[PDB]
Structure formats: C-alpha cells, structure tokens
Amino acid sequence: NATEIRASVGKMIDGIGRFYIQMCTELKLSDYEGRLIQNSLTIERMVLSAFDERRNKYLEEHPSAGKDPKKTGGPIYRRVDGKWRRELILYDKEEIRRIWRQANNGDDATAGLTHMMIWHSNLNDATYQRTRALVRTGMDPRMCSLMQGSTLPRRSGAAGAAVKGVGTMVMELIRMIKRGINDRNFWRGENGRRTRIAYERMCNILKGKFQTAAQRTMVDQVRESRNPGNAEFEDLIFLARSALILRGSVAHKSCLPACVYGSAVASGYDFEREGYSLVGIDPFRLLQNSQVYSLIRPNENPAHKSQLVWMACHSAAFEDLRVSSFIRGTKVVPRGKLSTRGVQIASNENMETMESSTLELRSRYWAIRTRSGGNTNQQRASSGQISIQPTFSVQRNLPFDRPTIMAAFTGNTEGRTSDMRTEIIRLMESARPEDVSFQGRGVFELSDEKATSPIVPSFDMSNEGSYFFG
Amino acid sequence: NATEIRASVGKMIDGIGRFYIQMCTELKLSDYEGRLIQNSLTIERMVLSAFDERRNKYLEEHPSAGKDPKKTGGPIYRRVDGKWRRELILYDKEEIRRIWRQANNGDDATAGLTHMMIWHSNLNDATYQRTRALVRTGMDPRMCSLMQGSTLPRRSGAAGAAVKGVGTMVMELIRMIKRGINDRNFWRGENGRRTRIAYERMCNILKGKFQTAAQRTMVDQVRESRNPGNAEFEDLIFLARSALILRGSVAHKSCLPACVYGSAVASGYDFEREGYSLVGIDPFRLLQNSQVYSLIRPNENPAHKSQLVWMACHSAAFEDLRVSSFIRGTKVVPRGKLSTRGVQIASNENMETMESSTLELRSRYWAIRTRSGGNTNQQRASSGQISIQPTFSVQRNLPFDRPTIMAAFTGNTEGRTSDMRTEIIRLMESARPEDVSFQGRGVFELSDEKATSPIVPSFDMSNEGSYFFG
C-alpha cells in the first residue's frame, strides 16, 4: 500500500512547515525575510546542531572554542529600508528542541531530520565537490560523480542510508582502514566489536546498492578479511572505478528548502489530505508557484544562481546538462564558466555589497526520478526465465539452464578479487558510450497528473558537454 | 609393541620361503636351478597374474590373445650338461592358488603379495625408468627420481600404498584428469562416485607423504575443485617440481628375491623364533651368506650385473652413488657406462649365448633405511615449543607464539595455488646443495647387532657424480 507512506511523509512535511512558521513568528521577520535561503540555512543548521546528540555529548565534556556551552552560530540577515544587516544571535538547544517537540505532535521527527541532512548533502554536492579528501586518500579526483551525500554523518538512518553514495562509502571505509593501519584498533575490546559491526553493516548497504552479480560477490568476498591490510584498499578503489560504469542506484531524494514548505503550509495546503510524494510530480508542483529571495554579490550573476539553486533543490548537480536543460527549458552553464560562488556567504565579507533578488525555479517539464540504473547493464546481461514449473502432469524433461545455475551459486568459489577484476574489465570493454538507457520512459508535461503520455528527448547538439565538472 | 609385527613378517616370509621350496620340489629343478633369478621371476610374475583378481575378471569375459583361458607365460630355464634350454610351460591358476592356500596355513597372504609387487617395482625402477610416460603426459623427464613404484597397480593396499611415490601419484592423477577431460566421466553415476572416492583417497595418501605445511595446505586446496580442468594439471606438475627438493618420505622397503628366502627357510632358519625385520640389519644378514646364480649375455659384464641386482634388491637405484659405493665397498658404475642390459631376458634371443654365473651380494657395511627426509627442511623450519602449560598456580602471563598460531590455522585462507607457489619458491631459494642431512646417524659395521657405534662417511672425491642417470 502507498497511502500510508504518503500520509506519513505529508504529516512530517506539515510538521516541518509549521515549525518554519513558528520560527517566522518568533524571529519577528518580515514577509520578504522568510523568503530568504540564508535564514533558512542558518536555522536549519542550528536544528542539525541541536538534534545531533553525538557531537553535543562530545561537546559538554569539551568546553572549548570560547563561547560554546550550548549556543552556536546564528547569522540572521534583516533588511533595513533597502540595505541589509547581519546579526550573530545565539539560541539555546533545549528551547528549540521543545519547539520541535510540539511542532510534530510530540514526536522526535527523525525522518524530518534526515530530510534536512539530505538537503544539506545536495547543497554541498551542488556547490563544492571534495576532491581534497579524494587526493588525501590517494583517490583520483576524476570520479567526483561518486560523491553523493559526502557531507552526511553516519547518524542518518536507513532513509539517510539510501542517499549516501558508493564513492562516499569507499571514502569512509578507507578512513577506517587507514585508522586501523595506524594503530591496532582491531583488538578484542568493545571498540573492535563496534567497528566490525559498522563495517559489515556498511558492506551490506554497499551490496544492496550495486546491481550486477559479479561486483556483489566480489564485495561479499571483501569482508572475508578479518584483518584488513592494504589489498582491500586497491580493491575498493577498483570497486569505485568499476562502479563508474556499473553505477549503483543509490538515491536522488528531491528535498526542498524550508521556506517553500513553510509558504505552502501557511497558505492552508494541508499535505495529509491530498497526499505528498517526494519522487513524483508533487515536489515539482509546489515550485512553479513558489517565490524565493536570496542575497547576491555585485559580481555574481543571478541567472546562474537560480539555475544552481534549482540544481541543489533537485539534486541534479551530477545529472547530464542536456536533459537538465531540457527539463528546465533553458541552457545550463557548467561549473567551468559559472560567474558565481557558493550560496553560503562568508562571515567576514562586508555588509554593503549584498543585494537581494528573486530566484527563478519554474521549469517547463517534469519527470519521475527512479532509483535505478542505465539499461546498458541489462543489455550486457539479458533477462528471461532460468527454471520451469510443471503445470500439466506429463512425462517430460524439466529444462534447467545449468551453466547459469552454477554462475548464480559460484560452485567453484572465487579465489581472490583478481579473477573478478578480469571479467569486470571484460564487461567494461563490452560497454559502449552510445547505449541508450531508460527504455519505455519519457518526460511528461506539467498539465499531466497521472503520467499518461510522455515525449522522448532527442539531443543532436554536437558535443556541448555532458560533464558539469571540467 | 614391535614383537607382534616382527612375528607377523617372519611368519609371512616363512610362508613365502616354503612356497618357494614347494615350487622347487614340483618343478623338479636341480640345486643350481633354484639359485636362479630368472626362474624366480617367472614363477613370481605367474603368482602375480594368478592372484590379480581384477585382470583375471577382465580376462574370462575377454577370450583373446589366442591361448589364454587361464595360463600365461612360463619360460623355465634348465641347465643341460653345461648348456641351457628354455621351455614355455603353462600352469593353471587354481592349482597354484591352492598351493599358496596351504603354503601359508590357510591364509590369503596379501602381505606377501604386496611384497612381490614391491620387489617388482624395485626391479623395474633399477632397470628402466619410464621417461616415455612422462613425456606422454608432457612431464619433464628430468625428474625420473620421482618414479618410485611406478609399475605398481592400484590393487596394492596400505603397505603397498607406502612404497608408491609422489611422482607416480602425479602421473596416475594426470591420467585420470586427462580421461575426465576427454569425456564427461564426472556425471552422477556410480562411476563418478568411485572416481571421486579414489581421487580423495590418493590425495590423502599424498598429504600423508609430504612433510612441510605449505605443500600440505596447497594439496588440501587441490581437491576443492569439484570439476578438475586444466589448472590443477600445472598445479600437480609444480607440486612434483617443488617436491624435487622438499621430497616426501615415501618408503624404501628392502624386498629380497624368493630364492634367498627359500634357501634360508630350507636350511631351518625359522624366522618366527628369532624374529624378522625388513628395515634393520636383518634383510642384510641373510645376503653375505647367500649364493645367487643368473644368466648373462657374452657381452654383459657380470661385475656390473651384481651391482645392479644388489641395487634392485636394496632399492638403491635412486640413492646417491657415493654412499651406495661406501656401503657396498666398491665403486658403483652409473647408468651411463653400464655395459649390461635389463635383467629380464627377451623371448626371441637365442639359446646358445647364455652363460650362468654367480652374483656378488656381500657388502662391507650396513645402515638403517628410515622413511624420513633430509634435515635441510628442518633447517629451513626450525623446531621448538609454541605453547606453554601452567604447572605452578602463579599469577602470570601464558606466552603464546601468535604469528605461528595463525600460520598453522591459516586465518586468512589461501586464495589460490599461486600465493603458495610464491613462498614455496622462496623456500626453494633458501635451499642449499651443501646442507648436510641425517644428523646424529651413521653407518655401522656388520659385527654390530644393536646399533651401538656408527662411523660417519666423508666424501671429498671431487665431482664423481651423485646422479645415477645422466
């Protein structure tokens, strides 16, 4: 059944929206002030800090960073008769914790929290990619397209586990491997137990994310090493390099800024009644009638800023430029020639140069974001029955496709990773960059509500460049 | 206890000797005729044919080779007033089967049969080495020193399993692998069951024969292949090539010709009372007072023939020439310049040229033939405790040599054969051709009965050549 999940997501988004309304009430902000991305970012990171129990518990035992008992940050921006001002106002954790407490009818709202962490992950992935950590681990910065949800902490649950990508998991595993190489953390203490439990859980998440059998079995053989040394390091690097083409269907949750949700909730559009979806038309239908303001530097182009924020909202920073432009309706500028900077504003930059303006979010078309992979993998490995069932009682043979039956079982168990690298490189060679994917699907029009008739895109515009980076 | 085994071997050798006396009685042969190697060979191969149930059962359903209901061979040689004559006399199987039946007090005498097969194995190994089958299997004929007991059939029991060597087992396994590659004999029929049972038993015998742990574990990983293809072929070739230096202590049973046993039994030297041993001084003490005659071609050197037959009796054809000469007391001629041929005589060669003469078997010294390996392996891998036991109840640590504890268990199981080839080649590199072996042991004098004082040999005679072949 899908009605229950729809009601649950509608309920928790209604809670988030009415929390945002409560914030707009308590901050004494004007109508325009509540349509700002920056203040939503500030309050939302404040919520992240308040609800992150582990960092807090690390902090009350560590009274450092000067003024840090329980209050952090808070750069609220207010419009003064056309000009702008920034104030560093500090808020307690317990008060706003309880404001959430009645902002969700007595619940913890963990799903909402995961929504905020995921929307932060999308903003960071859209703005800045961490080539720095990649090169730190020795890992090639050519594969930044594997950095989905890198800024996410491990505190996120299964819903948060859905969005964090393959390459980010390679990075976090490499971090723990380097730590275990530096010192003997693998002893029989409770620390070793929690490390191996986390390691096996993360490997299970990995094997869930992949699609092809060969990579799944190689990963299953990865955690056989009770004492991970150096071989699994290049094993995981090659895992990422092979997942370049055999990508895992991780997630692309379409999280939206708190201002848009709050404006919708304030207008009386209760999400529980008509339902809410995070994947279909629904996150789209709020945006063509949404007004968003933000601050811009006197050199930044607002036209680029609108495209970038729509990227971040729809987590399309790692999507191809051609289809993103087709859905948007206008050409999208790659990261190479963007005359803009990060949407976050520095704490030291001067107050005079900021100017507020409206953000354009309307898009001509819409499409469903499925958590799947390209059809090319199913082209490499076709589909069909392998077994048969006797319906009539007739004296006949039972046809069994035996050579694939051994392949599923792997009768002769794989010796090491290398034998798997062999046929996975063979599959990579079988791959082609002209393999059309997602057959039977298309882009629909905004007037469509039940996905009745799509239109297939056709891109013949030479080599404009399907690479947002470079 | 060793008295029971001594009594058993004495009993079965007494049975063999009195069977030989019965044969000398029934053949109506003269005193000199019973001191011939050739007639003993003929009657003994006849016994092999009579007691080999499998070939017989293959033969009564296959009435071929003309005159072959139940009688084969029988080239008995008789001395006629100085000259010689050869007669092809044919004997039934059941009569001589029953002659054995009372020749051993109603027993089957399987141990005696194994003794005859092993003595045939020694004669064949001394005379001719099967480079032909080696090259047939593609296997290098440089390693003929691994052909111990090649002519032995698989019918031999555990006692017979002791003497058949590592390279011969490589050959028989290669034969079955080639047969299973030619046709799909690995189906679920009873034939497949008996093949896998034999294969696992022979692998168990192999792992019993080896000494070092690495080769044992690699062999244990050999039979993991449920469908042996081509990889295990070079795996077994490399097994033989590595066993070149890390040799297995297979066996060197000192079997003696039936004429010597029969002469001893006829004289009244009952073996049950004073005991018999096949490994110590005992098989030696019968030979300095043993008279043996044999036929020789007018070009063959009797001096070479005596040395070769003493080789075959003591199965020292694959022993070093220096120590063999030292124990014998005279220089031993290598196979390169032996002006003699096989002790078996062709069925087509003429009757005129044969001449009978005495065979010299007396040796100056004696030594024990242990089924062990060179001390060099224990030099590569030293000896000592690995664990400790608390004798006093004292609050103290229990010292455990952990890195070797994993090595015995192989905590990270070996991926394939290649990782084992690595360190086994490392051990081969660590090997030296100057490693003195068999420390604490020596060659004793014939006057010694209880192994009280040996004398250590010292060979400084340049490079005479410790290679019987080549």
Task: Spell out a b/e string for B390-420, using b for 16 or more CB atoms within 10 Å of the CB, else e.
Answer: eeeeeeeeeeeeeeeeeeeeeeeebbbbeeb
The SS3 call for residue B1 is coil
* Cα–Cα nearest to B167, from B252, B253, B238: B238
**Nearest residue of chain B to residue A229 (CA atoms):** B412
Cβ-in-10-Å burial (0-12, 13-18, 19+) of B229 comes to: exposed
Residue A83 has φ and ψ, to the nearest 5°, of -80, -175
Give the whole-angstrom CA distance, residue B120 versus residue B342. Answer: 13
Phi/psi-derived region of residue A384, left when phi > 0, alpha when psi is between -120 and 50, beta in every other case? left
The answer for residues whose C-beta is within 8 angstroms of residue B403's C-beta and 6 or more apart is: none
Angle at CA of residue A224, ends A221 and A229, nearest 5°: 105
Task: Spell out a b/e string for A59-73, using b for 16 or more CB atoms within 10 Å of the CB, else e.
Answer: beeeeeeeeeeeebe
What is the DSSP pairing of strand B83-88 with strand A355-359?
unpaired
Q: What is the DSSP letter of A146?
A: G
The answer for residues whose C-beta is within 8 angstroms of residue B390's C-beta and 6 or more apart is: B396, B398
**CB nearest to B415's CB, from A226, A411, A416:** A416
- Number of Cβ within 10 Å of residue A188's Cβ equals 7
The first and second tokens of residue B114, run together, are 């194994």
**Nearest residue of chain B to residue A226 (CA atoms):** B412
Residue B126 near residue B169 (C-beta atoms within 8 A) = no
First to last CA, chain B: 44
Residue B369 has φ and ψ, to the nearest 5°, of -105, 90
Number of helices followed by number of strands (H, E) in chain B: 19, 6
Which residues in chain B are contacts of A225 at CB distance < 8 A?
412
The SS3 call for residue A86 is strand
Give the whole-angstrom CA distance, residue A343 versus residue A340. Answer: 9
Q: What is the DSSP letter of A396?
A: -
The SS3 call for residue A85 is strand
Please give, one letter per residue, the 3-state secondary structure of B60-84: HCCCCCCCCCCCCCCEEEEEECCEE
Give the whole-angstrom CA distance, residue B348 versus residue B141. Answer: 30
Which residues in chain A are contacts of B227 at CB distance < 8 A?
411-412
Which residues in chain A are contacts of B403 at CB distance < 8 A?
none
Give the whole-angstrom CA distance, residue A118 versus residue A251. Answer: 10
Residue A24 near residue A262 (C-beta atoms within 8 A) = yes
Phi/psi-derived region of residue A255, left when phi > 0, alpha when psi is between -120 and 50, beta in every other case? beta
Q: Where in B323-364 does DSSP place strands (E)?
A: 355-359
The first and second tokens of residue A410, run together, are 């792997």
Cβ separation of B415 and A411 shorter than 8 Å? no
Tell me the resolution in Å. Answer: 8.7
Interface mutation target, options A410, A412, A421, chain B, most CBs of B under 10 Å: A412
* Cα–Cα nearest to B198, from B139, B155, B166: B155
The answer for residues whose C-beta is within 8 angstroms of residue A194's C-beta and 6 or more apart is: none
Cβ-in-10-Å burial (0-12, 13-18, 19+) of B367 comes to: buried
Task: Spell out a b/e string for A433-451, using b for 16 or more CB atoms within 10 Å of the CB, else e.
Answer: eeeeeeeeeebbeeeeeee
Q: What is the DSSP letter of B102?
A: H
The first and second tokens of residue B278, run together, are 């096949």
**CB nearest to B225's CB, from A225, A226, A412:** A412
Length of chain A in terms of residues written: 470
Give the whole-angstrom CA distance, residue B435 versus residue B55. Answer: 46
Give the whole-angstrom CA distance, residue B61 versus residue B63. Answer: 6
Which residues in chain A are contacts of B411 at CB distance < 8 A?
226-227
The first and second tokens of residue B88, run together, are 């092809």
- Number of Cβ within 10 Å of residue B455's Cβ equals 11
Give the whole-angstrom CA distance, residue A342 versus residue A349. Answer: 13
Residue A292 near residue A438 (C-beta atoms within 8 A) = no
The first and second tokens of residue A408, run together, are 């599923």
* Cα–Cα nearest to B109, from B198, B209, B12, B30: B12
Q: What is the DSSP letter of B335?
A: G
Q: Spell out the alpha helix ranges (H) of A267-342.
A: 271-274, 282-285, 302-314, 321-328
Residue B461 has φ and ψ, to the nearest 5°, of -85, 60
The first and second tokens of residue B213, run together, are 């742990």
The answer for residues whose C-beta is within 8 angstroms of residue B27's C-beta and 6 or more apart is: B33, B39, B76
Number of helices followed by number of strands (H, E) in chain A: 19, 6
**CB nearest to A416's CB, from B226, B227, B416:** B416
Residue B26 near residue B116 (C-beta atoms within 8 A) = no
Give the whole-angstrom CA distance, residue B378 versus residue B438. Answer: 11
* Cα–Cα nearest to B358, from B305, B411, B417: B305
Which residues in chain B are contacts of A412 at CB distance < 8 A?
225-227
Give the whole-angstrom CA distance, residue B435 versus residue B433. Answer: 6
Question: How many Å separate Cα A468 from the centre of its chain?
Answer: 17
Residue B70 near residue B55 (C-beta atoms within 8 A) = no
How far B225 CA lies from chain A's nearest CA (Å)? 7
Rounded to 10 degrees, what is the CA torsion of A27, A31, A33, A36? 120
Give the whole-angstrom CA distance, residue B211 versus residue A417. Answer: 31
Residue A210 near residue A216 (C-beta atoms within 8 A) = yes
How were these coordinates obtained? Answer: cryo-EM
The SS3 call for residue B358 is strand
Interface mutation target, options A184, A222, A232, A416, chain B, most CBs of B under 10 Å: A416
**CB nearest to A225's CB, from B225, B412, B416:** B412
The first and second tokens of residue A467, run together, are 């690479």
In order of A216, A217, A225, A246, the CA distances from A417 in angstroms are 12, 9, 12, 17
Angle at CA of residue A127, ends A374 and A34, nearest 5°: 115
Helix (H) or strand (E) holding B171: helix B166-182
Which residues in chain A are contacts of B188 at CB distance < 8 A?
none
- Looking at this protein, which amino acid is placed at residue B1? N
What is the DSSP pairing of strand A75-80 with strand A83-88?
antiparallel
Rounded to 10 degrees, what is the CA torsion of B103, B109, B114, B116? 0
* Contacts A–B by Cβ distance under 8 A: 14
Residue B86 has φ and ψ, to the nearest 5°, of -120, 130
Which residues in chain B are contacts of A227 at CB distance < 8 A?
411-412
DSSP string, B194-218: HHHHHHHHHHHHHHHH--SHHHHHH
- Number of Cβ within 10 Å of residue A12's Cβ equals 21
Residue B160 near residue B118 (C-beta atoms within 8 A) = yes
Residue B49 near residue B55 (C-beta atoms within 8 A) = yes
Rounded to 10 degrees, what is the CA torsion of B423, B427, B429, B430? 140
Phi/psi-derived region of residue A294, left when phi > 0, alpha when psi is between -120 and 50, beta in every other case? beta
The SS3 call for residue A390 is coil
**Nearest residue of chain A to residue B229 (CA atoms):** A412
The residue behind tokens 């060679």 is: A429
Task: Spell out a b/e string for B180-218, using b for 16 or more CB atoms within 10 Å of the CB, else e.
Answer: beeeeeeeeeeeeeebeeebeebbebbbebbbbebbebb
- Number of Cβ within 10 Å of residue B439's Cβ equals 10
- Looking at this protein, which amino acid is placed at residue B61? E
The first and second tokens of residue A201, run together, are 């859980």
In order of A392, B336, B397, B406, B409, the CA distances from B388 in angstroms are 69, 55, 10, 17, 18
The first and second tokens of residue B393, run together, are 């109840």
The answer for residues whose C-beta is within 8 angstroms of residue A428's C-beta and 6 or more apart is: A242, A245
The residue behind tokens 């969700």 is: A104
- Number of Cβ within 10 Å of residue A413's Cβ equals 9
Give the whole-angstrom CA distance, residue A211 versus residue A383. Answer: 14
Residue B327 near residue B363 (C-beta atoms within 8 A) = yes
Which residues in chain B are contacts of A416 at CB distance < 8 A?
415-416
Residue A172 has φ and ψ, to the nearest 5°, of -65, -35
In order of B23, B44, B93, B271, B400, the CA distances from B96 in angstroms are 9, 11, 6, 24, 63
Residue B129 near residue B469 (C-beta atoms within 8 A) = yes
**CB nearest to B416's CB, from A225, A411, A415:** A415
Rounded to 10 degrees, what is the CA torsion of B309, B312, B316, B321? 30
Beta bridge partners of A445: A365
* Cα–Cα nearest to A219, from A378, A421, A403, A409: A421
Question: How many Å separate Cα B155 from the centre of its chain?
Answer: 15
**CB nearest to B412's CB, from A226, A411, A415:** A226
* Cα–Cα nearest to A432, from A373, A376, A375, A374: A376
Residue B318 near residue B357 (C-beta atoms within 8 A) = no
